[PDB]
């Protein structure tokens, strides 16, 4: 409610005071009352990369005709005044034994865009399994063969085109894979301008009505920042009010803990203000 102008006055003023950060610290991380059962079953415990980052039952991604569990959540951000919904699947970095289910989600829904917001390793520890092959190798995951047909590094991210072939049926599917490598776990992007350019590039690569698969290591911190920013960009361009706290709450009603740290929330709120101001015309 209110207007874009008033919401940005409210955000700038509350950044200054700073009531914006206090209200973020007050927000629940996990919505009370939402069941989390499947994620804790004995056969599924080691399918979670982190013990405390689990999908709600209501928004858990199911594999079509397949009972295998995956730690993945549907996250949809509605902009109702624009009759717009931005769909995501937010998931963790696959483990060695969950690559099969990851690629099954991609196949089931013919997802043509994967956004990976992590390096494979940090400080000697593995943060994500390499679920694609180094070109020109071909990888087998759960009855999909994967090959990387193109790989180009920019400054901040790597752009890969991947071919997914179904071993059972012979069909093929192509996926664009963006790996943002300049953004450490529980941190902010190394460069804010690279981040914003990357978010707007992701927006431009959206296919109509198709979820973007977004993941990091846990799939909540850096993913939450990106989702918040894309939502805010859509709201700014449509002259609609932006309440970052409402956005984070809406995400957290669908996948717990989205936007991990106060620094990450402060970063995205400042970025939102920046975008609004440098786009503002008298």
């Amino acid at each position: 409610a209110d207007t874009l102008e008033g919401s940005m006055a409210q955000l700038k003023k509350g950044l200054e005071s700073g009531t914006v950060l206090i209200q973020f610290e007050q927000l629940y991380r996990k919505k009370p009352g939402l069941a989390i059962t499947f994620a804790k079953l004995p056969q599924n415990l080691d399918k979670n990369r982190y013990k405390d980052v689990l999908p709600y039952d209501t928004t858990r991604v199911l594999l079509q005709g397949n009972e295998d569990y995956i730690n993945a959540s549907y996250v949809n951000m509605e902009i109702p005044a624009a009759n717009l919904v931005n769909k995501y699947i937010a998931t963790q970095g696959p483990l060695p034994h969950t690559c099969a289910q990851f690629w099954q989600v991609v196949w089931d829904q013919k997802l043509s865009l994967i956004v990976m917001l992590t390096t494979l390793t940090e400080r000697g520890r593995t943060k994500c399994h390499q679920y694609w092959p180094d070109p020109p190798d071909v990888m087998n995951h759960g009855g999909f063969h994967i090959q990387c047909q193109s790989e180009d590094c920019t400054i901040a991210y790597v752009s890969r085109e991947m071919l997914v072939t179904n071993t059972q049926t012979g069909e093929e599917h192509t996926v664009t894979h963006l790996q943002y490598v300049a953004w450490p776990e529980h941190g902010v992007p190394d460069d804010s301008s690279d981040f914003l350019e990357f978010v707007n590039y992701v927006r431009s690569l959206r296919v109509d009505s198709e979820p973007v698969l977004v993941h990091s290591s846990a799939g909540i911190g850096r993913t939450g920042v990106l989702v918040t920013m894309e939502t805010a960009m859509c709201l700014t361009e449509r002259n609609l009010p932006i309440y970052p706290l409402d956005i984070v709450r809406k995400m957290r009603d669908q996948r717990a803990m989205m936007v991990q740290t106060s620094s990450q929330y402060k970063f995205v709120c400042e970025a939102i203000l920046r975008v609004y101001e440098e786009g503002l015309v008298q």
């Binding site: 909540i220 803990m257 991990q260």
Partner: peptide, 7 residues
């Protein structure tokens, strides 16, 4: 099984 680290 360990928690997602925080800073």
């Amino acid at each position: 099984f360990s928690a997602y680290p925080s800073e």
